[PDB]
Amino acid sequence: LKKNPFVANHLLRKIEKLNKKAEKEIIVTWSRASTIIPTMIGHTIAIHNGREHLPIYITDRMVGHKLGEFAPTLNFRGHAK
Amino acid sequence: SRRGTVEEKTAKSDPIYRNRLVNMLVNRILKHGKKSLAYQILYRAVKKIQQKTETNPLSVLRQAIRGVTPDIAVKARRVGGSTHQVPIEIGSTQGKALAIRWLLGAARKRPGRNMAFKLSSELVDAAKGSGDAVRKKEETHRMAEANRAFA
């Protein structure tokens, strides 16, 4: 609490840029360690795993957590298959 | 070893009773390298034996070693023939330490509140014929007389 959460500038600008318009402008990102401020609520964001970007819709119960928790990059279904 | 000449260790005695038998009895109690705790196990026991028997605990301890000491054992050999177990005698020093292992061994196994109580009831019972260590003497002594013939 002594410091603010981590939110990159390249992401913060794009999020703040769209609040003026208030419309879907589906966007790609790369920083998985970014915290979800409630200003990016109702938007849809694509998070870069090892391979590609994963568009995910933002829910009100995602605020305190970061983006990377929802973007898996291990890709394991079953064993010996 | 292959030398056959093992040095004779300096058998020490305790401060109070000033006998070497007691110090040999203590060295088998500890297992983590601490001696101050064994006397709290011992000095509470011999005091407890005196509390029950109304006599010196030294004679009761000297009698227990005198009764449990088998002075004979059986060892396996196959230098001639297969699966032979003929008897073999025991010296004075060997039989002395050999009885301490059986007493403290049975004391740890039997139930009780603490090692001082487990040790007290062992020596008092062992001196009076009936003792778990005395049973092992009978079992070991049985195998000797059973295989009395050298075969």
């Binding site: 119960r61 995602m62 957590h65 990377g68 928790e69 929802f70 898996p72 | -």
Partner: protein, 111 residues
């Protein structure tokens, strides 16, 4: 039901007998006595007014009920939202950076 909808033994001390309650650990058991500044006597020998004074103060914390519900909803929060940590609960696997190659017999056994 001695206190808090649980039958506690009557032979143990007070400090090390409230701990059987699902919401009372080792520190909370001491904080209650220290707030009431009473002596840690036996469980059965305790007076009625003093034991009454415990029954009113223990209910202030998340003792039982809402405690187990406050947790289960929290684990349910991660499952429906599909966090990384939420999927591992569904898989019956840990979520705090453990290695899963040769350990974790607790959760693998608790399938």
């Amino acid at each position: 039901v001695r206190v808090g909808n649980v039958e506690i033994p009557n032979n143990k001390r007070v400090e090390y007998s409230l701990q059987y309650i699902h919401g009372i650990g080792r520190s909370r058991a001491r904080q209650i006595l220290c707030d009431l500044t009473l002596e840690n006597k036996l469980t059965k020998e305790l007076s009625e007014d003093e034991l009454l004074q415990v029954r009113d103060e223990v209910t202030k914390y998340m003792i039982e009920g809402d405690l187990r519900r406050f947790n289960a909803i929290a684990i349910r929060r991660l499952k429906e939202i599909q966090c990384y940590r939420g999927v591992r609960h569904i898989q019956g696997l840990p979520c705090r950076g453990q290695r899963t190659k040769n350990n974790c017999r607790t959760l693998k056994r608790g399938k």
